[PDB]
Amino acid sequence: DTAIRVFAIPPSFASIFLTKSTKLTCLVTDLTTYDSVTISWTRQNGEAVKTHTNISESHPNATFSAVGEASICEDDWNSGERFTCTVTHTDLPSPLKQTISRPKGVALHRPDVYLLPPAREQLNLRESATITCLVTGFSPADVFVQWMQRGQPLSPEKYVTSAPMPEPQAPGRYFAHSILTVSEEEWNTGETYTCVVAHEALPNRVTERTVDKSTGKPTLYNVSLVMSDTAGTCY
Amino acid sequence: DTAIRVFAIPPSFASIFLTKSTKLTCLVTDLTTYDSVTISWTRQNGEAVKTHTNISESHPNATFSAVGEASICEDDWNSGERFTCTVTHTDLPSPLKQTISRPKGVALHRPDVYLLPPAREQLNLRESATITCLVTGFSPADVFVQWMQRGQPLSPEKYVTSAPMPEPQAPGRYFAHSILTVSEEEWNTGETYTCVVAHEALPNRVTERTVDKSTGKPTLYNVSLVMS
Amino acid sequence: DTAIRVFAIPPSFASIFLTKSTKLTCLVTDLTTYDSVTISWTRQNGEAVKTHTNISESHPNATFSAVGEASICEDDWNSGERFTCTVTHTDLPSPLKQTISRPKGVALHRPDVYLLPPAREQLNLRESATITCLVTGFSPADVFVQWMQRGQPLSPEKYVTSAPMPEPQAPGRYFAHSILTVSEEEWNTGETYTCVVAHEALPNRVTERTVDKSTGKPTLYNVSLVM
């Protein structure tokens, strides 16, 4: 494609996990607003797709058209289920096709999560606390993360998350970050803070982690090794 | 998204902080194909300034364009002024006042830096270890970070820093992270790792924070060998 | 040279650091009554400087003060030019020129900083503790030291510093000192103190160090044998 770009935003793992609907959206920008702007979807093999449900009524430039999508199940996402968005308009001499396939993730690596509590220095400020859920040692990309508190998915306005960047050990490994701001007192009590990470490489695509003052480094050690010359069983 | 697209560039402070040299360059992606360019560099005061040079005639797009560098004084450029070049075109006067200068003013805040050590699980696995450097609560953006081991600047490949992102508390606040890989053996009784941070809203333009094995807290064991 | 000094001297590392703007002064006096006398700053490019200020006459020490000054950026000051100041006087129609320069070569070594905590006998008596930021094995000279607590610096009103002295067992290497005094309870609350060592021969021209009571806390044990 050279003239008149065509966007194509496939469904991310977040919607597959939370929304549970794989919708492939494709649109055309910087184009005229007349009729004949038909957006369709079909498989490269020749098979079509489900009806384009939940169309977009308004448009950025009031482009009179109908975005093409398909409420296909997750089965059309693994490796060998490609798609093609076809767009037709009177301005162009022929319709434009946009083919899309799966990245075909390779060199699967079980994510290795290593959480650690907030830095000591913040505690001296006594103004606010921040928690990290850095994730590393995983492949492929597209790892989702969320901050739960007793089964309360926190809103994105509360926690932020970063995309994954290549790891320095090898290019077949990525790492990402996700922070969440809270009050210092709330962190003091623990409040059953948990981090949920979803990745395809995981056997169940869900892994939960948690941290507390005890987890980091308890200075005290009230160790009591009872010699108990003779107990045999649990004395 | 509609023309005049600028490709991703490294406007970070390291552009001049690694080599300690003022560099001035401004261009637009996919420029109109024309012979030469109407170079023009002047300050906002009114007096002209030495124009850039060293035009490297090499592009992947094969589009006839020009790109170079200009070194200027530091007082004027860092005078709280967003220096913008004024390079125009031969076919038509098009002064591209692109702000290659960093955003001075707006709001200054100390970038709080915390240097956190690897988790117990990572070290116990005895395969590698990662040290984290969190930078939080600062303004404006574009805060640079680097690593050192007692004057031994480790290769950029070893560590990696995220580009700045906005903070959930408010847009003014930002935060960034820098991770460094290293073997566990050195983290036990090896060398100290220092995470230096550079920002315009700093007194010396740079700070530093070191960590080593004892970075935690002193353990106070209370063993009680109760016997018969 | 303070009294009778017809030369020009540049600001030192501390002056450039505090002002953040490299300058250069030319003092010429105690030779004859200097009234309404001109001053020029011939640089390598041969361009007189502007922005002249802080000029007064009728000095109480029986003379006339007409010290000239220039303000530039470090792009050229480090380049190692030969800046000159010229003064033509009535009794001396000949141009009284004074050229200066900077060292274009010298051995540079990282400043080995070591922050030593208060002595046990220094604070055992419930008195003002003292903290010393020893710095040694470094060169060239003129290292600026300033103390920083929490997130702000402290003026010499509270601390003091020494000048460089040559090293005893390290030719070509100098060392300095700097003490910050503190109250007893203030130190006992841990707090945060850090000596900042501005020196050119540094990876980034600036370093820092911190040592407080928590630093010297080796692993502790409390055994209890019971039988």
Swiss-Prot record, chain A:
Region CH4, annotated ranges: 106-215
Result, substituting residue 146 to A: Has no effect on IgM BCR assembly
Record region (CH3): 1-105
Effect seen on changing residue 152 to A: Has no effect on IgM BCR assembly
Cysteines paired by S-S bonds: 26-85, 133-195
Post-translational modification: N-glycosylated; important for IgM secretion and its localization at the plasma membrane. The interaction with FCMR is glycan-independent.
Domain Ig-like span(s) in chain numbering: 11-101, 111-212
Glycosylation sites: 54, 61
Outcome recorded upon mutating residue 192 to A: Has little effect on IgM BCR assembly
Annotated disorder: Agammaglobulinemia 1, autosomal recessive: A primary immunodeficiency characterized by profoundly low or absent serum antibodies and low or absent circulating B cells due to an early block of B-cell development. Affected individuals develop severe infections in the first years of life.
Quaternary structure annotation from Swiss-Prot or TrEMBL: The basic structural unit of both sIgM and mIgM molecules consists of two identical heavy chains and two identical light chains; disulfide-linked. N-terminal variable regions of the heavy and light chains form the antigen binding sites, whereas the C-terminal constant regions of the heavy chains interact with immune receptors to mediate effector functions.
Described function: Constant region of immunoglobulin heavy chains. Immunoglobulins, also known as antibodies, are membrane-bound or secreted glycoproteins produced by B lymphocytes. In the recognition phase of humoral immunity, the membrane-bound immunoglobulins serve as receptors which, upon binding of a specific antigen, trigger the clonal expansion and differentiation of B lymphocytes into immunoglobulins-secreting plasma cells. Secreted immunoglobulins mediate the effector phase of humoral immunity, which results in the elimination of bound antigens.
Name of the molecule in the record: Immunoglobulin heavy constant mu
Species, as recorded: Homo sapiens (Human)
Gene (name only): IGHM
